């Protein structure tokens, strides 16, 4: 009684449209544009009304 069970879940943001057979490299080299705000910080807008 044999039973494989495989999962997989990539979750990328953001580079070149991901696909399973992609190397861990051609991802990187293809990051020239396709940049994404991974972290951000700002102020409450009432502060800017001066």
């Amino acid at each position: 009684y044999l039973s494989n069970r495989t999962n997989s879940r990539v979750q990328s943001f953001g580079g070149v449209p991901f696909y399973p057979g992609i190397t861990l490299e051609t991802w990187q080299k293809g990051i020239t544009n396709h940049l994404v705000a991974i972290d951000r910080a700002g102020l409450p807008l009432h502060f800017f009304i001066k």
Binding site: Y1, N4, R5, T6, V10, S12, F18, P20, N33
Partner: protein, 50 residues
């Protein structure tokens, strides 16, 4: 499309009443498996008499 815009990573021409903010990717693979196999066997008698 007067002052005709374009997305920052220029590969589109948005109309000049919209602005874009670029990001994504996500996918997930998963599969399963099930097998079986059975067998059996036999019986025999014999008597040679007199």
């Amino acid at each position: 499309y007067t002052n005709c815009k374009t997305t920052e990573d220029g590969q589109y021409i948005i109309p000049d009443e919209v602005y874009t903010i670029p990001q994504k990717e996500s996918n997930l693979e998963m599969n399963s498996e099930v097998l079986e196999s059975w067998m059996n066997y036999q019986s025999t008698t014999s008597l040679s008499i007199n």
